[PDB]
């Protein structure tokens, strides 16, 4: 296909801080990282047109959901510290 | 293409509000730790965004729901969805 | 054509609190304040069709970074309390 425009999602946390930027284009999502050092790519790769994310500490460890939507179904993506992994999370949209 | 979404978080247990605007209309899907519900936020909206704050352990949820080139302020602060003064000049 | 729906973005802070709300309308972001008395046009203008968000607290001084894409281009924006300034983020493409 053609994107028109991209649509973007972030988030953040710590004080360095780490911060992630998922982009959705041509219905897959994307991840960039940022820890302090530059910009690099993330692991999550998954299809979507629209993204949006949040995140929270437990301590020191971060944990992170995504919100894939394509069409009316919305897929929760969750990282918890080893690897993405679908989410509990439904809608009946 | 697709519904339009918005997420935020509190706490470490945590809460999670996810805000989905589909066909005009915006809804709620709500997690406190043990299961997703649906949620009391129902108001007109194409595009949403969302922020909240912690007020020592009381949430304060502010919901930006845009039609046109209007934008309205729903506000949760522990009874109710009300309408904010936030305005916009687009 | 009639103006499409805006999109918008929205971040806080603090307990007072502090909220800013983005706006993409019709190519540009503009930017809406709030820190307990009563909304008012921030400093932030730069082009855009899309718009997130994210801040953090280093201490008390808020960092705000705003993604911005316009086609496939997102330029990040930064806010470390004394203006904003082109961040390094970029994208995968
Ligand atoms: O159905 S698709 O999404 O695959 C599609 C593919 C192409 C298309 O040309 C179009 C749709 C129609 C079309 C849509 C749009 S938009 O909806 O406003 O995005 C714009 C155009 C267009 O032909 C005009 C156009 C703009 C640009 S740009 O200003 O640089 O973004 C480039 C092109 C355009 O035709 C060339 C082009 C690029 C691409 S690319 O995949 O992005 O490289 C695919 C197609 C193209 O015609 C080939
Ligand atoms: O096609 S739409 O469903 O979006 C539509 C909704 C409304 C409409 O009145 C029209 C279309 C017709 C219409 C078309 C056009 S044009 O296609 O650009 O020539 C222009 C207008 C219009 O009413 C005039 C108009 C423009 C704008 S602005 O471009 O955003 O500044 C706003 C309005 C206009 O009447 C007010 C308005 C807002 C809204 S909103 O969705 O609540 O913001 C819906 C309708 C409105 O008429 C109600
Ligand atoms: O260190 C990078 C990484 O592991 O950080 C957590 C998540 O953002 C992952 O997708 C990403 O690959
Ligand atoms: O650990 C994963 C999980 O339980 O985390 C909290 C919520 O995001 C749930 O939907 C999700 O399945
Ligand atoms: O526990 C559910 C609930 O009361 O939580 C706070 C807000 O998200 C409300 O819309 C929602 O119904
Ligand atoms: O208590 C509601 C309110 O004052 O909260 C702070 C801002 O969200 C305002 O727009 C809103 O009217
Ligand atoms: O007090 C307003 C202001 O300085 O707050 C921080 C940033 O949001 C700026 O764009 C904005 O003008
Ligand atoms: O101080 C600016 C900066 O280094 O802050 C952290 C990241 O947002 C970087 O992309 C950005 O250039």
Redesign the interface.
């Known amino acids: 296909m053609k994107?028109?425009?991209?649509?973007?999602?972030?988030?953040?946390?710590?004080?360095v801080?780490s911060?992630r930027?998922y982009?959705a284009?041509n219905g897959k999502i994307?991840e960039?990282c940022?820890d302090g050092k530059?910009?690099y790519?993330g692991a999550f790769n998954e299809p979507?047109?629209?993204?949006?994310?949040?995140?929270?500490?437990?301590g020191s460890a971060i944990?992170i959901?995504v919100?894939a939507?394509?069409?009316?179904t919305?897929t929760?993506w969750c990282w918890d510290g080893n690897g993405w992994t679908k989410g509990?999370?439904?809608?009946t949209?």
Do not use: F, K, M
């Open positions: 994107a028109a425009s991209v649509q973007t999602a972030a988030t953040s946390w710590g004080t801080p911060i930027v982009t284009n994307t960039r940022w530059g910009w790519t979507g047109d629209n993204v949006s994310v949040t995140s929270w500490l437990v944990h959901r919100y939507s394509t069409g009316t919305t929760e509990a999370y439904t809608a949209n």
